[PDB]
Design a protein around this ligand. Sequence first.
Ligand SMILES: [NH3+]CCCOc1cc(-c2cn[nH]c2)ccc1C(=O)Nc1ccccc1
Length: 316
Amino acid sequence: MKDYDELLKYYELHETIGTGGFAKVKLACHILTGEMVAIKIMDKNTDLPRIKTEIEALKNLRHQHICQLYHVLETANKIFMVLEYCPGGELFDYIISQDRLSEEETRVVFRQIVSAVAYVHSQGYAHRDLKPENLLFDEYHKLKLIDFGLCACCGALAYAAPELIQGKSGSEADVWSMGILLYVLMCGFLPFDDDTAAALVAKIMRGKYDVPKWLSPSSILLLQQMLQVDPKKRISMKNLLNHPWIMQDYNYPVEWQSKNPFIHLDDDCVTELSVHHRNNRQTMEDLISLWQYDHLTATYLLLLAKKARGKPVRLR
Ligand SMILES: [NH3+]CCCOc1cc(-c2cn[nH]c2)ccc1C(=O)Nc1ccccc1
């Protein structure tokens, strides 16, 4: 169509891996850097507050375990979101293939979850829809959080904290959500499951769940700290980070602080953008710091990705 005309100035489109709604996702290729991206194609004409809440949160959140927003491109009929390439699939699909994971393996995965959410909370937000479908793997087998549709709001019931279902919410509901996630990783089934919703709300409030035989007392203890019906009783992120289970095969707490900065500009990247946009530093160093999430924001971030993979820093 004529909607893809501003898109095709910057991206060489590829295979669709999204068939169902505006949740439709085409693979893409950045023309300048040569780096692989994923394009979410939303049409406004067809829930668009979930698109607006997402974009706003992603513009302000920047983290090694959060799926990066590079470019927002808004024609008359359509909203395009250009996001990081996660070829490794859903953590959901990873679990249901493997038939549950070992404590050693779940920790490797779970420490990346703690890292992302601890930063989300440090930035004033709460995700409100944490589930293994909303955590994807990049090509280096490292996790990236998605779907900021709800933010600082009911997501999926199986993962919803009791106080949230009651209408008594803000970041404690995420700690419970991570406690449901920790169980499914180690068991390969939900701690609270039924046929009807009124039956599933009944099982959450009461809070009694099964403890499979193969679970360690270290796991059993952390699960009961995270799966408390009282959110005041629920373990704090400050105590989660340096928990002894979190530590078990790592002698150091979860590194939660962002290695991906907003203020700091890479010198190799600011200079390579100059020799192509026909300008100088100071004029470019402030132009990148605009963070408009236009073509310049996509080109900078993907160059900063290109440098990190070991390849030489160049645009075409
Ligand atoms: N609606 C879910 C589509 C899954 O694709 C993505 C969605 C988001 C997303 C949606 N909302 N927020 C982030 C971010 C990245 C991807 C992605 O890179 N997927 C992928 C690419 C290549 C191969 C396999 C998977």
